[PDB]
Design a protein around this ligand. Structure first.
Ligand SMILES: [Mg+2]
Ligand SMILES: [Mg+2]
Lengths: 152, 66, 252, 159
RNA sequence: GAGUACGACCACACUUGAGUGAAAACACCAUAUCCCGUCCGAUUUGUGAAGUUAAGCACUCAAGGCUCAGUUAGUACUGAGGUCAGUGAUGACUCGGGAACCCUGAGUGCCGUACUCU
RNA sequence: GGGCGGCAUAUCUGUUACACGACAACGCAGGUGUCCUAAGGCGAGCUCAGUGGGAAAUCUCACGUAGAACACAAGCGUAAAAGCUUGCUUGAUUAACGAUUUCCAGUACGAAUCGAGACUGCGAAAGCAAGGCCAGCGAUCCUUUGCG
RNA sequence: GAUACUUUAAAUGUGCAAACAAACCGGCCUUAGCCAAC
């Protein structure tokens, strides 16, 4: 009502973790970003140039543009009854490569390896069995489960 | 006199649903992108259009032959 | 008097980087040196690292990687005896020779040795380096000096001139060379050539012998009977030796 | 023991805390120059007014001036003058007493002498590259400064 | 098994106190006519090589810290339920999720590129 | 209730606020209509607040994870710096009607982010800089100046 | 702290992905794009 600025209420959001202050590192500088990659937008509070608005601090999107020091990202934002695609521009210090598709890529790679082996005629690995089946249980220790006087 | 509340708003917003975003492959304009790459891509696309016209002419001639 | 480094002092303490604690690397400068345009999607970029010890000089060509820097090629001033230089390592002339040796080895490895012959003639002149940032372009690298102070006449710039004359592209202005005059804003190629070939060494050596004639400096020269009026010729011969055999290193 | 532990005079410091901005401070600046042969440096309070003059002499000149001051001090001072971390000092009340011919244009000043002692190899704490801290065995104890006082410009601690 | 230069991760690597250090190197160290800079060759810059492991450094050894487990504990808290109990504060129960400090056990850097020595 | 008082009428920080975002009261505690040719830009050198031992406020040595400073309120951030001293400078200019964020009707205004071109500054170089990060401001019509 | 500010840290939440205009494996064409060059 009385005060609504660009960075209002970011006291705990734009702060560094305990005993982890400092500035970005050469690993961040040496990271390659292409158009079409998935990235996470995480604001780095020690840079302060090209920082995103607080709404975008935990979101994942697609890169649509690369400049000498900046990245353009598409991020979904629901407004009233629809979802908008917002284009934000940030410095490269404030993005990270996303691992949101690791499992899918791994599944495709394993499928290719299986196809190669099946065509080669190599023996396939033994398929895993279910853990919800029956069987005979041979016990080592049996006890008595009870509520005793000393318990209370 | 000046009341404020959000009481019925989510219910209103879900009657015709929250619509999903437009797919990535539609409305994929490049306006506002980094200029030098844009300028190069335009030249490549012009050459590609010329090649498409030539390929169609060759197909038509081949079909006429047989 | 309460102790400072008590229990609560250690819990809130953040250690600096390893090489910052050892006082070796200026990470603020390193970030600006390794930074590159993001639109150049990780194309190679090279540093010429120069480090001067007490008894040697080191010069290498380095490209940075996440796993760790890799060295394309390295040269040391301590192997110049195999080319014909002794008793006079770690000075300005040996710096020039070290730079030229590194450049020759690098072009020879990259297979462009015949092209970009460099400056077969030696002169302390200035010639702006040809760069795309402004015919096949010359191989390029940027200079890295570390924590060293960049005063006029310092040996890092002599190392730099060695490579520039060997035929490398290293962007630079002639404002920190020995012959430069700040007020007039011009360079004295005669003075720079004198320092390249080591006339000042000869002058000092003559002075010390003439003074010590009556009744520890330059002890190895005096012991080995090195005479003045040959230092310039010795350096000039070493340059040709390098340009003939760029890889002839110390024996065994 | 090892020759590398020979105690040496690192430096000598001369101070005049005039506390006044007028002509007396400038005359002190002149006499300091004529004494030490190196240009003194001014010192301002924390303000914006110069209130002190001082120097830092190193070498055989430092040794000579230290001996000269010790002549006036009669080679006798007080034990509490010595301080932990190895250093001491004193003062002179009549400047011409140090063999300086009196000039009427100036008067007399209360000079202060301080000394610094240490071994060789303390560069590792003032170096730019790989600056570190000296080990404690290599340091100098107050008792050791007292012991060096004897047999090198011998005098009386007069504790 | 070591050293140097550049490094990625940035305390299992830090702080304090001791002992050992083959050869190579790194370093203290000598010096001030020239390039260059200071009140001061201290720092820095140039040119050197007599001496020394005394310090820096590396390794090993004892305490605060740091890191990974265990206990604390199915405890504190919490999503869902009742025409549940209680004047009420609050509490237990039914279907699920599930900590932290303290205390205690273990250890005390690791991975690259280039060139060198025993 | 209205009057009196006040501004909760433009506008910022911490809380209210319930670990995405959003969220009210003449709710609470505080700020704003200015100031700066340097208190703007860049390169280099240096380390601060404070504590302990010495010397007829100042000089000296050790320690010192920021406990100081950054025009002004507050919160974040920063140590071979983003603080302090110093050298040179005017990027506080121009910028083909480029794109975007915040408010939001996804209108404008104010503020801000990523850019392309010109002319430049500082630096050996990589680089950095089109004000002082984030509050400090204004339609139609009319008047007036610059430009072709 | 004072005499509630905070290292740690839930439950309930919240963003993205999970093969038909997409992605994987090898020819070739074009660019007055990057790179010393390809
Ligand atoms: Mg521009
Ligand atoms: Mg009017």
């Amino acid at each position: 009502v009385h005060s609504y600025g660009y960075k209002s209420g970011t006291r705990h959001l734009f702060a560094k973790k305990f005993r982890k202050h400092g500035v970005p590192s050469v690993s961040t500088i040496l990271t390659n970003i292409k158009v079409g990659d998935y990235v996470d937008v995480v604001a780095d509070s020690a840079v302060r140039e090209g920082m995103p608005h607080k709404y975008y601090h935990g979101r994942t999107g697609i890169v649509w543009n690369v400049t000498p020091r900046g990245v353009g990202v598409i991020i979904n934002k629901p407004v009233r009854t629809r979802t908008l695609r917002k284009r934000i521009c940030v410095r490269f210090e404030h993005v990270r490569k996303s691992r949101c598709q690791e499992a899918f890529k791994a599944k495709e790679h394993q499928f290719q390896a299986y196809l190669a082996a099946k065509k080669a005629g190599k023996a396939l690995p033994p398929l895993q069995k279910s853990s919800r089946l029956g069987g005979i249980v041979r016990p080592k220790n049996v006890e008595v489960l009870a509520r005793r006087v000393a318990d209370y | 006199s000046k009341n404020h509340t959000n009481h019925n708003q989510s219910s209103k917003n879900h009657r015709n649903g929250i619509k999903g975003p437009v797919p990535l492959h539609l409305h994929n304009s490049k306006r506002g992108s980094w200029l030098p790459a844009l300028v190069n891509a335009r030249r490549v696309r012009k050459h590609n259009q010329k090649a498409a016209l030539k390929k169609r002419r060759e197909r038509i001639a081949a079909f006429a032959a047989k | 008097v309460k102790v400072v480094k008590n229990k609560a002092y250690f819990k809130r303490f953040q250690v600096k980087y390893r090489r910052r604690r050892e006082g070796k690397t200026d990470y603020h400068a390193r970030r600006q040196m390794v930074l590159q345009d993001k639109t150049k999607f990780g194309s190679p970029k090279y540093r010429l690292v120069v480090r001067i010890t007490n008894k040697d000089i080191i010069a290498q060509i380095v490209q940075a990687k996440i796993v760790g820097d890799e060295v394309v090629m390295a040269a040391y001033a301590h192997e110049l005896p195999a080319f014909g230089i002794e008793h006079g390592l770690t000075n300005y002339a040996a710096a020039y020779a070290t730079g030229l040796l590194l450049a020759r080895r690098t072009l020879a490895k990259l297979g462009i040795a015949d092209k970009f012959q460099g400056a077969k003639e030696a002169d302390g002149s200035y010639s702006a380096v040809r760069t795309k940032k402004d015919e096949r372009f010359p191989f390029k690298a940027i200079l890295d000096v570390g924590l060293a102070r960049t005063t006029t006449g310092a040996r890092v710039f002599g190392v730099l001139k060695g490579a520039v004359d060997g035929g490398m592209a290293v962007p630079h202005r002639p404002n920190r060379f020995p012959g430069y005059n700040k007020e007039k804003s011009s360079l004295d190629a005669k003075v720079h050539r004198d320092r390249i070939f080591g006339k000042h060494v000869a002058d000092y050596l003559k002075q010390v012998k003439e003074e010590a004639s009556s009744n520890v400096q330059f002890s190895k020269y005096m012991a080995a009977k090195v005479l003045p009026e040959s230092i310039e010729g010795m350096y000039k011969k070493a340059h040709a030796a390098i340009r003939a055999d760029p890889s002839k290193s110390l024996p065994k | 023991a090892n020759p590398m532990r020979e105690i040496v005079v690192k430096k000598l410091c001369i101070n005049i805390c005039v506390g006044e901005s007028g002509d007396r401070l400038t005359r002190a600046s002149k006499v300091l120059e004529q004494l030490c042969e190196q240009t003194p440096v001014l010192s301002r309070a924390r303000r914006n007014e110069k209130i002190a003059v001082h120097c830092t002499v190193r070498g055989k000149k430092a040794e000579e001036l230290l001996e000269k001051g010790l002549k006036v001090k009669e080679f006798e001072l007080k034990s509490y003058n010595f301080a932990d971390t190895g250093s001491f000092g004193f003062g002179i009340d009549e400047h011409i007493d140090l063999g300086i011919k009196y000039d009427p244009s100036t008067g007399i000043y209360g000079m202060d002498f301080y000394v610094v002692l240490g071994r060789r190899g303390e560069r590792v704490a003032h170096r730019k590259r790989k600056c570190s801290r000296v080990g404690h065995s290599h340091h100098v104890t107050k008792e050791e400064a007292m012991k060096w006082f004897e047999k090198v410009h011998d005098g009386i601690i007069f504790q």
